[PDB]
Amino acid sequence: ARQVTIIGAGLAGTLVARLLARNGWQVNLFERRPDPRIETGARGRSINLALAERGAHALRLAGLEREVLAEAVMMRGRMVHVPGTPPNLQPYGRDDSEVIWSINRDRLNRILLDGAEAAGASIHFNLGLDSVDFARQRLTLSNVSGERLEKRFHLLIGADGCNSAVRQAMASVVDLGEHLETQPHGYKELQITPEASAQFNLEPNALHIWPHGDYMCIALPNLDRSFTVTLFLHHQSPAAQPASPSFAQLVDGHAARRFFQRQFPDLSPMLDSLEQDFEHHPTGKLATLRLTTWHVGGQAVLLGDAAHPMVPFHGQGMNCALEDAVALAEHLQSAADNASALAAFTAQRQPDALAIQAMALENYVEMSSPTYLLERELGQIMAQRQPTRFIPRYSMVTFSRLPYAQAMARGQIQEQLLKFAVANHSDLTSINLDAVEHEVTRCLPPL
Amino acid sequence: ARQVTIIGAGLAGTLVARLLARNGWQVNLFERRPDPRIETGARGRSINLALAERGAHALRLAGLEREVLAEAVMMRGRMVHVPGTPPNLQPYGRDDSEVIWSINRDRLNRILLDGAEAAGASIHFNLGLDSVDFARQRLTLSNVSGERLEKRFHLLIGADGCNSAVRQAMASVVDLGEHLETQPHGYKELQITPEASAQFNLEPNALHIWPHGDYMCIALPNLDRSFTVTLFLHHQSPAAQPASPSFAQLVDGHAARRFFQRQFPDLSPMLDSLEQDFEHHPTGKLATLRLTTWHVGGQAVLLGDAAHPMVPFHGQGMNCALEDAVALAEHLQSAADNASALAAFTAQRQPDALAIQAMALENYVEMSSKVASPTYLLERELGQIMAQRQPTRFIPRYSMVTFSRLPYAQAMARGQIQEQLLKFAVANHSDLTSINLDAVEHEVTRCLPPL
Numbered sequence: 001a002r003q004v005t006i007i008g009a010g011l012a013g014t015l016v017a018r019l020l021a022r023n024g025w026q027v028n029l030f031e032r033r034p035d036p037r038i039e040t041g042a043r044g045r046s047i048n049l050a051l052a053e054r055g056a057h058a059l060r061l062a063g064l065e066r067e068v069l070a071e072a073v074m075m076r077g078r079m080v081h082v083p084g085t086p087p088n089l090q091p092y093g094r095d096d097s098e099v100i101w102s103i104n105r106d107r108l109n110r111i112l113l114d115g116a117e118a119a120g121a122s123i124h125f126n127l128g129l130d131s132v133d134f135a136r137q138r139l140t141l142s143n144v145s146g147e148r149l150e151k152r153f154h155l156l157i158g159a160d161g162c163n164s165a166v167r168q169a170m171a172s173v174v175d176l177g178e179h180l181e182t183q184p185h186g187y188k189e190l191q192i193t194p195e196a197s198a199q200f201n202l203e204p205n206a207l208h209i210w211p212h213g214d215y216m217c218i219a220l221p222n223l224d225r226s227f228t229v230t231l232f233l234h235h236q237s238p239a240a241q242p243a244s245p246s247f248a249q250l251v252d253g254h255a256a257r258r259f260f261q262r263q264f265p266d267l268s269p270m271l272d273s274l275e276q277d278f279e280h281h282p283t284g285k286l287a288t289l290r291l292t293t294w295h296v297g298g299q300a301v302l303l304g305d306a307a308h309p310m311v312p313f314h315g316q317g318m319n320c321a322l323e324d325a326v327a328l329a330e331h332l333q334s335a336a337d338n339a340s341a342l343a344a345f346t347a348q349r350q351p352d353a354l355a356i357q358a359m360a361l362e363n364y365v366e367m368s369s370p371t372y373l374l375e376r377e378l379g380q381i382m383a384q385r386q387p388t389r390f391i392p393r394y395s396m397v398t399f400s401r402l403p404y405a406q407a408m409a410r411g412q413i414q415e416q417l418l419k420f421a422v423a424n425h426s427d428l429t430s431i432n433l434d435a436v437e438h439e440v441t442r443c444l445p446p447l
Numbered sequence: 448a449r450q451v452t453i454i455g456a457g458l459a460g461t462l463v464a465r466l467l468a469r470n471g472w473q474v475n476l477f478e479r480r481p482d483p484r485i486e487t488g489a490r491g492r493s494i495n496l497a498l499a500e501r502g503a504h505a506l507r508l509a510g511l512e513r514e515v516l517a518e519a520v521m522m523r524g525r526m527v528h529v530p531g532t533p534p535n536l537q538p539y540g541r542d543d544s545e546v547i548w549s550i551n552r553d554r555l556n557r558i559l560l561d562g563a564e565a566a567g568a569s570i571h572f573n574l575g576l577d578s579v580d581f582a583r584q585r586l587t588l589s590n591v592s593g594e595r596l597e598k599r600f601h602l603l604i605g606a607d608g609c610n611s612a613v614r615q616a617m618a619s620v621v622d623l624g625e626h627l628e629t630q631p632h633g634y635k636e637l638q639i640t641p642e643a644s645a646q647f648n649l650e651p652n653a654l655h656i657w658p659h660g661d662y663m664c665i666a667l668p669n670l671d672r673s674f675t676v677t678l679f680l681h682h683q684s685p686a687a688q689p690a691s692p693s694f695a696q697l698v699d700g701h702a703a704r705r706f707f708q709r710q711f712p713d714l715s716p717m718l719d720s721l722e723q724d725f726e727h728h729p730t731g732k733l734a735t736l737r738l739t740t741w742h743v744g745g746q747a748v749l750l751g752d753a754a755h756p757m758v759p760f761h762g763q764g765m766n767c768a769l770e771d772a773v774a775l776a777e778h779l780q781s782a783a784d785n786a787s788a789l790a791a792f793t794a795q796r797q798p799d800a801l802a803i804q805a806m807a808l809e810n811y812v813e814m815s816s817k818v819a820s821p822t823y824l825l826e827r828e829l830g831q832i833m834a835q836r837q838p839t840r841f842i843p844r845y846s847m848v849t850f851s852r853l854p855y856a857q858a859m860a861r862g863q864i865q866e867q868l869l870k871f872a873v874a875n876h877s878d879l880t881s882i883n884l885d886a887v888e889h890e891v892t893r894c895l896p897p898l
């Protein structure tokens with residue numbers, strides 16, 4: 001039986017552990033954190049995530065989809081909140097088949113851990129990777145208190161997140177050709193209780209957004225009617241606009257409260273613990289990191305956030321990481337050797353990871369807020385008339401398994417076609433709809 | 448009138464002498480060598496240099512550009528000689544306005560000497576600087592016979608080259624924070640006569656390169672159709688590769704001939720005096736020398752090769768030295784005092800000199816390996832499309848350095864963004880037809896601000 005060591009019992013690491021173990025591999029998985037299945041007297045994390053068709057299909061192949069979806073809330077559309085105006089619901093599709101699922105991160109992780117152990121994987125918690133000796137095929141792990149221990153390895157999988165220790169170790173033996181692109185927005189996680197969401201009639205079966213230009217809030221629902229809110233705001237005010245809101249200006253919870261009362265007036269009354277949440281939860285960092293290569297011969301490979309950190313504005317990081325886990329297990333299972341498997345996995349996934357990283361950056365403007373309204377109106381008519389040809393980019397990314405690079409290329413043809421059709425036209429009445437449709441049939445092959 | 452003493456009537460020294468003298472400064476310029484304008488029975492042999500936009504603009508400001516260009520050969524592009532295919536011409540840019548000029552060193556120096564004297568500078572030849580007493584504000588000079596003489600000075604400019612005597616003297620009063628980085632390649636100059644270049648149809652209006660990985664040849668044309676071929680090759684073979692070519696393995700001219708016949712077959716028949724040139728011309732040494740400071744209060748400053756020796760792989764040493772002369776004259780003319788001028792000149796120029804020193808080291812792989820690589824060819828093709836679509840955002844690094852006056856550090860920083868963008872766009876793609884050009888252009892607009 002072939003041997004493998006995986007670092008990081010997160011989302012990609014735990015899924016790939018189950019896929020390899022059920023195919024007869026000897027799997028050992030190491031995780032820095034404690035086992036979340038061991039109940040303690042501590043609170044429990046409220047982190048939520050949007051699970052889309054790519055992630056759901058990966059779980060389906062692993063035989064875990066039904067168990068995960070039993071604990072997920074259906075989001076039928078986007079609820080856009082602009083002050084004074086009643087919240088406006090934008091459905092995703094025509095029926096409940098085109099939906100996004102809101103899943104609690106730690107509930108999903110527990111299901112994945114049980115799934116990996118049921119398949120035969122051995123999981124070791126409270127052990128963080130410190131360094132790797134590639135020549136000697138040994139690695140060094142330690143607990144939170146610094147006690148160190150060495151382990152021999154044959155194949156190493158880095159599923160250890162955006163600040164991957166496996167990626168750092170690989171830099172000693174290969175040039176990963178890394179390029180880090182910082183993002184000016186930080187993030188802060190806040191909470192809405194079940195009592196507060198019911199009192200203010202906040203729709204449970206929707207994804208909520210409070211656009212505000214250079215800053216915004218989003219909220220995802222939980223099974224118990226509570227919601228997890230995320231604030232996206234610049235860490236610092238730029239030199240050109242020193243008066244503009246930023247985390248630096250919000251000195252404490254009371255400053256944060258005054259900011260929410262002014263800028264998010266319909267949201268502030270639902271955040272009962274705003275002051276406490278603001279001071280106790282740390283401000284998160286966002287970035288895009290692109291690598292030239294993801295592997296070292298047949299010895300080590302990266303996947304998920306360890307290979308391609310992206311900005312969270314398309315809700316696709318976990319979905320991409322689960323898609324990566326399926327592809328890595330498929331290549332490893334049937335290749336001539338580990339070196340061939342790792343090079344083939346990198347060649348397949350790199351162009352698709354680059355495409356979603358680019359589309360996620362673009363999506364910030366679409367979430368944070370007449371010509372666009374005209375193009376949207378025309379696009380909707382084309383989608384209704386040619387459903388196998390004109391498919392909005394958001395739908396190709398969220399509700400299909402079309403490779404990310406293909407969704408990006410087709411979306412470009414669609415945008416170009418809409419741009420020329422609307423150019424130097426005030427409204428829809430001056431546009432020949434049949435001529436635009438003929439151009440759709442002329443430029444977009446059916447899928 | 449403000450007084451200044453300059454050491455070295457080279458390229459930077461003679462230009463700064465004209466700029467200061469025409470602005471009313473009392474200028475005295477000291478040079479170790481004899482006056483090259485005095486005709487003797489000796490046979491003078493100097494190389495041709497590549498003059499680009501930075502150097503040409505400096506001469507333009509000085510009113511000397513037309514005189515220099517009348518004696519220069521136009522290089523409309525690069526002629527790459529890769530084994531297995533005929534020589535291929537790569538035009539320099541968008542139009543024939545983006546050219547490099549091949550100018551004889553001695554001819555340029557003579558024009559600069561005439562220009563400095565016309566502006567009022569006094570030039571004293573056959574006097575080499577030996578030492579400086581900074582406390583006493585005196586310096587010591589000598590002739591070749593050894594007779595020494597002292598001179599008082601007020602402001603001292605060190606324009607005295609790679610082995611600067613002013614820089615050595617400054618080490619007695621300040622920590623220059625020097626760091627010397629040796630380079631493994633040596634160099635040898637070889638000749639192509641006007642008869643041989645015409646016989647073999649070698650293009651006169653181009654810069655020629657013969658890439659060969661760890662070694663290579665280059666050739667620049669002269670006004671008379673002769674060319675100087677420079678061979679860049681390791682002094683010694685490394686321990687890991689003892690069989691690899693090196694100067695140590697070429698004991699005599701006959702060994703050099705066999706090497707050229709095997710590895711540069713299209714070049715060997717043009718080098719009639721190969722054997723003689725190899726044995727009589729010494730092997731040159733290459734290096735990068737970096738300093739943290741270039742001045743001593745308001746008393747002395749370095750510029751050109753005296754301040755920043757660099758490897759010759761980007762043809763920018765003279766161009767950088769002439770750019771330094773314009774900046775030094777600008778700071779000295781307008782500052783509150785000499786101390787403020789020298790500190791401001793060093794703060795402005797030191798980061799730009801560090802950037803061209805780094806880009807010159809990087810240009811060796813570009814010329815010797817990348818030019819013959821299909822991935823570089825696909826990258827160049829994609830880069831050309833981006834340059835057409837976004838002309839104020841995507842400007843190829845070679846063009847920013849050679850055909851513009853953008854500060855070298857800015858050309859390097861923007862160049863890194865462009866290198867990464869092209870690398871990720873072409874990765875896992877065989878040709879241009881599978882690349883989403885609009886997606887690449889969006890990365891350009893997001894990452895590169897317009898200039």
Ligand SMILES: Cc1cc2nc3c(=O)[nH]c(=O)nc-3n(C[C@H](O)[C@H](O)[C@H](O)COP(=O)(O)OP(=O)(O)OC[C@H]3O[C@@H](n4cnc5c(N)ncnc54)[C@H](O)[C@@H]3O)c2cc1C
Pocket residue numbers: 007008009010011012013030031032033048049050051127128129130159160161162163164165187230284303304305306312314315316317318319320321
């Ligand atoms: C604000 C925000 C919102 C998001 N929303 C969404 C969304 O709606 N939908 C979506 O698809 N994605 C979303 N994402 C992205 C998503 O959270 C990640 O892309 C995903 O968790 C990556 O999965 P992974 O398994 O690669 O890494 P992770 O889930 O981060 O797992 C990495 C694991 O490695 C462990 N580890 C780390 N270092 C070591 C070490 N040295 N030794 C041992 N173990 C180690 C960690 O403890 C962890 O268990 C969001 C991200 C953010 C920040």
Ligand SMILES: Cc1cc2nc3c(=O)[nH]c(=O)nc-3n(C[C@H](O)[C@H](O)[C@H](O)COP(=O)(O)OP(=O)(O)OC[C@H]3O[C@@H](n4cnc5c(N)ncnc54)[C@H](O)[C@@H]3O)c2cc1C
Pocket residue numbers: 454455456457458459460477478479480495496497498574575576577606607608609610611612634677750751752753759761762763764765766767768
């Ligand atoms: C192989 C090679 C190829 C090159 N090709 C190019 C090219 O194509 N393009 C380009 O831009 N650059 C090129 N360069 C670089 C270029 O030659 C130099 O960077 C340039 O000459 C520096 O100008 P400078 O005025 O600072 O010094 P220099 O031109 O060297 O002048 C220094 C002067 O000081 C005098 N002097 C020295 N010591 C004393 C002393 N003690 N007392 C008095 N006088 C003294 C010298 O005699 C000389 O006249 C090349 C260099 C090499 C080695």
Ligand SMILES: Nc1ccccc1C(=O)C[C@H](N)C(=O)O
Pocket residue numbers: 496497525654665667759760761762763810814
């Ligand atoms: N004149 C030189 C002397 C020596 C070595 C290079 C040059 C160059 O000018 C190279 C040119 N800048 C290039 O990139 O092709």
Ligand SMILES: [Cl-]
Pocket residue numbers: 311312313314315316317318
């Ligand atoms: Cl995400």
Ligand SMILES: [Cl-]
Pocket residue numbers: 757758759760761762763764765
């Ligand atoms: Cl040079």
